[PDB]
Amino acid sequence: MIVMRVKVNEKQFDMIIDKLKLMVYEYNTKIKEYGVYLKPYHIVYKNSKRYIYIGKYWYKLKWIYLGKTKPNMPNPPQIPESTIIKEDNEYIVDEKILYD
Amino acid sequence: VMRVKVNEKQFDMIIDKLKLMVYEYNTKIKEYGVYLKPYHIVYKNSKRYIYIGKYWYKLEKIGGKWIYLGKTKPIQNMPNPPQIPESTIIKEDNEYIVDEKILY
């Protein structure tokens, strides 16, 4: 396999997050039966970067993170694994401010 | 060659330098009820603008603050501010490396 990695802006990134909430929303209202929640991503601040992990990350009621596998539940829809990296923020400044 | 691109660490330094520029002034004009913030942060078409300049605020309570005043020294017999330059900093859009196939 060749897997490419490509750059998208914040608006595109919210797209990927928003769909992942959308495809688990109908399931997640179903899980009120067992009082657990499937959040389809996990955000990690390591190496002075936002890491934004895509996967099944399970929460139990201050919602505690049980882990990454089903704790007799109904089998959510499939989430890909993948890794999303925030680029460092960058600012357009006029030089004179750097010059002072 | 006026406009260049810097990262958060340098931009944080830029903000930090400005805050030190006004720190001693704000202690001196603490007693007038007045705070001089040397920048103003604006969310316009979903970018974070940071304008550099004199932005004056006053302390008042209503019920239970920091109401904006103006760009200019509110009281003629306060000590003069340090010279903030007027300039515009624009934060670029956040950018993400994504696995290709997650794009459907």
Numbering used by the authors:
A (entry chain B): 1 to 61, 69 to 78, 81 to 109
B (entry chain A): 3 to 66, 69 to 108
Provide excerpts from the study.
We identify a hitherto uncharacterized protein factor that we term UBP (ucm-binding protein) that interacts sequence-specifically with the ucm and determine the structure of the protein both in isolation and when bound to DNA. UBP is a highly abundant protein, and we reveal that it plays a role akin to bacterial nucleoid-associated proteins with over 300 binding sites on the Sulfolobus chromosome. Importantly, UBP interacts with the N-terminal domains of MCM. Taken together, our data provide evidence that UBP functions as a general nucleoid-associated protein that plays a key role in facilitating the egress of the MCM replicative helicase from DNA replication origins.
To gain further insight into the function of the UBP protein, we determined its structure using X-ray crystallography. The structure of the protein, solved to 2.74 Å resolution, revealed a homodimer. The overall conformation is saddle-shaped with a basic, concave undersurface and more acidic on the outer, convex surface. The concave surface is maximally 32 Å wide with the stirrups at the bottom of the saddle approximately 22 Å apart. Homodimerization is mediated by a reciprocal strand-swap of the C-terminal beta strands of the protomers. This strand interacts with the neighbor, forming a 5-strand beta sheet. The interprotomer interface encompasses 1662.4 Å2. Examination of the structure reveals a potential π-stacking interaction between tyrosine 100 at the base of the C-terminal beta-strand of one protomer and phenylalanine 13 of its partner. We mutated these residues to alanine and in both instances observed an altered profile on gel filtration chromatography in agreement with destabilization of the dimer and an elevated population of monomer species. Our initial determination of the homodimeric structure of UBP in the absence of DNA suggested the establishment of a symmetric structure of UBP at the origin.
